[PDB]
């Protein structure tokens, strides 16, 4: 829902979505190749 939303807000009015009470399948993130920048701070991406 967050990644494939058709409309994204502007940077000055950035939209914030809270994600909780769910199981997070990160495999879609690694499988996706459209991503150009993937930097993680304070956590190993393989350890996510």
């Amino acid at each position: 829902e967050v990644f494939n939303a058709t409309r994204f807000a502007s940077v000055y009015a950035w939209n914030r979505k809270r994600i909780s009470n769910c199981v997070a399948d990160y495999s879609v993130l690694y499988n996706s190749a459209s991503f150009s920048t993937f930097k993680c701070y304070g956590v190993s991406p393989t350890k996510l």
Partner: antibody, heavy 122, light 110 residues
Framework: QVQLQQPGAELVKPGASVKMSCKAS????????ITWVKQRPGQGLEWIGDIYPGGGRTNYNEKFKSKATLTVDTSSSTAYMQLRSLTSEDSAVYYC????????????????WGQGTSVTVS | DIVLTQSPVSLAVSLGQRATISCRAS??????????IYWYQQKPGQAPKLLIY???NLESGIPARFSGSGSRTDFTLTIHPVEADDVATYYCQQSIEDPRTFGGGTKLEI
């Protein structure tokens, strides 16, 4: 363009502390992580820790968590590594270098390396 | 801690021949089709220079003779042809999980 400069050699008495400088130039210093790798003469390479100049976030190896303390100087674009409780086994060559850390890119690929500094503990 | 073993410890290869350096991982390195194994060349008295990243991609500026291969817990670095200036120690590094470790190194002799 991109240059990482280190002193040729450093001499420190056993049990003392030594401070290190890794001057960075030719690139945006705060956008690239800096790490230090220990190489004993005649041995392989050993990771010490990872630090991000932007915000000062630090990651330390469990073996070197109490031996090495890592700081940054964004004003001078210089990375600082401090070793305490130096002993005879700490005499090695440490290299400072930068990686882009992009998962869909190089990730932990370490393209460029600093010249390194050798320390004699006696 | 993933332990990387490099064989052979010393390799002698003449001009125009093929040199293969194999790095064995104690644990799996592949992660969703990505193998986090890096190859470096360290000339004596100099810092290591990156050759292969992700165990399959050649770094820019490196001659096409250097090539990487392997998957799962076994990876090999192939140099063909081998030139005179190839005398150095080659190290393999893994980055799937912390702490990142380096192999014992393979010394190449002409």
């Amino acid at each position: 363009q991109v240059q990482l400069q280190q002193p040729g050699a450093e001499l420190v008495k056993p049990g003392a502390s030594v401070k290190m400088s890794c001057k960075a130039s030719g690139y945006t210093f705060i956008t690239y992580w800096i790490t230090w790798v220990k190489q004993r003469p005649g041995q392989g390479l050993e990771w010490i820790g990872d630090i991000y100049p932007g915000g000062g976030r630090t990651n330390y190896n469990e073996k070197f968590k109490s031996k090495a303390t890592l700081t940054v100087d964004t004003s001078s674009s210089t990375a600082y590594m401090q070793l305490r409780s130096l002993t005879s086994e700490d005499s090695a060559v440490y290299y400072c270098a930068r990686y882009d850390g992009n998962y869909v890119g190089y990730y932990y690929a370490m393209d460029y390396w600093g010249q390194g500094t050798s320390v004699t503990v006696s | 801690d993933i332990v990387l073993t490099q064989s052979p410890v010393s390799l002698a290869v003449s001009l125009g021949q093929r040199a293969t350096i194999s790095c064995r991982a104690s644990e799996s390195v592949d992660f969703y089709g990505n193998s986090f194994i890096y190859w470096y060349q360290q000339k004596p008295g100099q810092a290591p220079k990156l050759l292969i990243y992700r165990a399959s991609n050649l770094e820019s500026g490196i001659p096409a003779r250097f090539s990487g291969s392997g998957s799962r817990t076994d990876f090999t670095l192939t140099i063909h042809p081998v030139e005179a200036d190839d005398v150095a120690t080659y190290y393999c590094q893994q980055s799937i999980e912390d702490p990142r470790t380096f192999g014992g190194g393979t010394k190449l002799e002409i």
